[PDB]
């Protein structure tokens, strides 16, 4: 299948409570594999998936240098952005960055990503060309001009097409038994009357990986988008994910409703009904 690597950086100021915290986590698809936290007692890059543990001390030290350097640079960046928005030194602010590469099923680069946010809003992003920028506002334009002057895009491109795909492929091979295994959802339909004249049908999907899934109800073969209650896909804690979709139906019409499930781990989509 297709696979991606992402790193997620969060830098958070906290005036009066020390210097800004910097935390980085790395993922392959929906599997986290490293973390770094400047607030740790002894900050260092730590493994968070078994297949990354085989990397040698050189790797851990390299990561640790990178994240310690970022920790310092993001503190400067937070100072800079506070000033770009004329903000007081009183408030707490957050810079986020998410970046990485996507591979297609043949292992070739599909595209790179590099986006940043300030206080939860788009700030600046690298365009799909990996050569030009999109700035959200006049403050982000200052960053854009600074990064254009320093040929930053060229650095990002070199990483996204280079080390990013090379290391992602390495991880995919080292963790192939899990990273390249799709576990299908285990499914069932439950039934709970809500009154004499209505009942809830809930369609469950459990134990699936990766997180991407489509779960829908149909009535007489028509999608029930507006009438369906969907919960956000949620982690089980064992690598797998869970989701349900529910609809309230007239008592006695239960068999007119079908639950449909699509998932990478499924050869053919499922159609399920309540089975009293």
């Amino acid at each position: 299948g297709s696979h991606s690597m992402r790193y997620f950086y969060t830098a958070m100021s906290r005036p009066g409570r020390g210097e800004p915290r910097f935390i980085a986590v790395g993922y392959v698809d929906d599997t986290q594999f490293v973390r770094f936290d400047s607030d740790a007692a002894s900050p260092r890059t730590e493994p968070r998936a078994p297949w990354i543990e085989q990397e040698g001390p050189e790797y851990w030290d390299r990561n640790t240098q990178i994240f310690k350097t970022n920790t310092q640079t993001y503190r400067e960046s937070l100072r800079n952005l506070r000033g770009y928005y004329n903000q007081s030194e009183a408030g707490s602010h957050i810079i986020q960055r998410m970046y990485g590469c996507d591979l297609g099923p043949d292992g070739r680069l599909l595209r790179g990503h590099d986006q940043s946010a300030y206080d939860g809003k788009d700030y600046i992003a690298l365009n799909e060309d990996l050569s030009s920028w999109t700035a959200a506002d006049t403050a982000a334009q200052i960053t854009q001009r600074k990064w254009e002057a320093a040929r930053v895009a060229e650095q990002r491109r070199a990483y996204l097409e280079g080390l990013c795909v090379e290391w992602l492929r390495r991880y995919l091979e080292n963790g192939k038994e899990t990273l390249q295994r799709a576990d299908p959802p285990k499914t069932h339909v439950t039934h709970h009357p809500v009154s004499d004249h209505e009942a809830t049908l809930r369609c469950w999907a459990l134990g699936f990986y990766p997180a991407e899934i489509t779960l829908t109800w149909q009535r007489d073969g028509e999608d029930q988008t507006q009438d369906t209650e969907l919960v956000e896909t949620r982690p089980a804690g064992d690598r797998t994910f869970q989701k349900w979709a529910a609809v309230v139906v007239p008592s006695g019409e239960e068999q007119r409703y079908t639950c449909h499930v699509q998932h990478e781990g499924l050869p053919k989509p499922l159609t399920l009904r309540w089975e009293p």
Binding site: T69, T73, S77, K146, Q155, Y159, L163
Partner: peptide, 13 residues
């Protein structure tokens, strides 16, 4: 592996 970040080189926002 994250984007390399050579000491002193990193361009801030």
């Amino acid at each position: 592996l994250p984007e390399p970040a050579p000491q002193g080189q990193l361009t801030a926002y």
